[PDB]
Amino acid sequence: MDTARIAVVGAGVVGLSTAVCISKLVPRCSVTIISDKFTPDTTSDVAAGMLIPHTYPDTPIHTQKQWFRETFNHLFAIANSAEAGDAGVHLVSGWQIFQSTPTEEVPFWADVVLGFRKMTEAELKKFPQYVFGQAFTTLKYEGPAYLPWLEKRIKGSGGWTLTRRIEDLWELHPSFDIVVNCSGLGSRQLAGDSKIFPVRGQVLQVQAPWVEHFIRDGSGLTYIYPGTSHVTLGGTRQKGDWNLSPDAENSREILSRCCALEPSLHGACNIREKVGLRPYRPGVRLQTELLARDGQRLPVVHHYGHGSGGISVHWGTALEAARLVSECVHALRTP
Ligand SMILES: Cc1cc2nc3c(=O)[nH]c(=O)nc-3n(C[C@H](O)[C@H](O)[C@H](O)COP(=O)(O)OP(=O)(O)OC[C@H]3O[C@@H](n4cnc5c(N)ncnc54)[C@H](O)[C@@H]3O)c2cc1C
């Protein structure tokens, strides 16, 4: 037929990024986006948005580092472009502190992020309960702004957004050629894999524009991130908690920790708490599965289980997923 009919389930940041890379990799494409919840309210919108490579347990550290590099150098061109307002990608400076001096003070992502260095004595004076610190400048992406921009790009490519429920993948078989699974935590029901589980995270969005440097205490328990609209203050990592009701004691402990780290936070307004379910998987599922039970073929390339560090690597993972897509499309062309 000389045309390929693609499909991407998932409206998260990676669900759209994958279709972007597919539209710019595969020669002949007709990729569509099909998800229950789109860019107004996805788990990628509630996300803080800082580009800090959280260490994946089950992925090669050089592969993960390269993913962060490929993502960073794309967002870095975005921040220097004219569309940085609409795409919502801005350079954010700040510091990563530590309770005790680590054995090695250089991570695997020092030479990619801008100007990795140590905190001076005068900089260590800003935090009395802390011995060692690091200083650097990264990029933060606003989800309620970045994801709509990706939508406006894929619309130019030729895709469209359908809002329907997909209980099982076989609904796409009698029409679509290949399916791209980017449903995130939802894929637990889609692909049946039980490895992915939800890590609950609650963040208080407070408004205080004087804060302009981010502050992360190394532990995931305390992060203070500046935002273009709401300063994002959070440190909750409950595991297996599907509960999306904002619990109050978390809003107490997060505020106490973050207020201790940055004191000027005392005079702040509009302390509105939201929650989210990180789709956690030891290794981000990125492989081509060919499921077909007493029927015709159905190639499905999986792409989920991003965890707490999926945004900082969403472009590299998109590249690898589009690689599998191109390989399988070639397998369909040639016999
Ligand atoms: C509070 C919080 C803070 C975070 N902070 C950071 C951070 O600073 N840095 C970082 O790198 N990462 C961070 N993350 C992680 C990051 O937000 C996610 O891991 C990642 O964006 C999710 O990738 P995804 O697009 O596959 O999943 P999602 O964003 O959840 O996208 C999945 C989408 O697929 C669709 N879908 C789902 N199920 C179905 C179904 N059954 N049928 C049809 N469509 C379906 C829906 O539209 C859904 O929104 C954070 C996460 C949370 C919760």
The end-to-end distance, rounded to whole angstroms, is 14 Å
Approximately how much helix is present in the residues? 25-40%
Structural class of the secondary structure composition?
alpha/beta
Encode the helix/strand succession as letters.
EHEHHEEHEHEEHEEEEEHEEEH
CATH superfamily of the largest domain: NAD(P)-binding Rossmann-like Domain
Please outline the major beta sheet: 9 strands, mixed
Q: Kindly state the number of beta strands.
A: 15
Annotated CATH architecture of the largest domain? 3-Layer(aba) Sandwich
Q: What is the CATH topology assignment of the largest domain?
A: Rossmann fold
- How much beta, percentage-wise? 25-35%
Structure description:
The chain folds into two domains: 1-88 and 142-196 and 281-334, NAD(P)-binding Rossmann-like Domain (Rossmann fold); 89-141 and 197-280, 2-Layer Sandwich (D-Amino Acid Oxidase, Chain A, domain 2). Helices cover 27% and strands 25% of the residues. It has 335 residues and is of the alpha/beta class. Helix 1 runs parallel beside helix 5 and helix 2 (61-79) packs across helix 8 (314-333). The strands form two sheets. Strands 3, 4, 5, 8, 9, 10, 11, 12 and 13 form a nine-stranded mixed sheet that branches. A six-stranded mixed sheet has the order 6-2-1-7-15-14, covered by helices on one side. The chain contains eight helices and 15 strands. The protein starts with 5 loop residues before the first strand and ends with a helix. It is elongated, with a radius of gyration of 21 Å. The protein binds flavin-adenine dinucleotide. Residues 9-15, 35-38, 42-44, 46-50, 165-166, 182-186, 190, 201, 203, 276-279, 304, 306-312 line the site of flavin-adenine dinucleotide (FAD). Flavin-adenine dinucleotide (FAD) binds next to helix 1, strand 8 and strand 13. InterPro entries: D-amino_acid_oxidase_CS, DAO, FAD-dep_OxRdtase. It comes from Homo sapiens. FAD binds at residues 36-37, 43-44, 50, 307, 311-312.
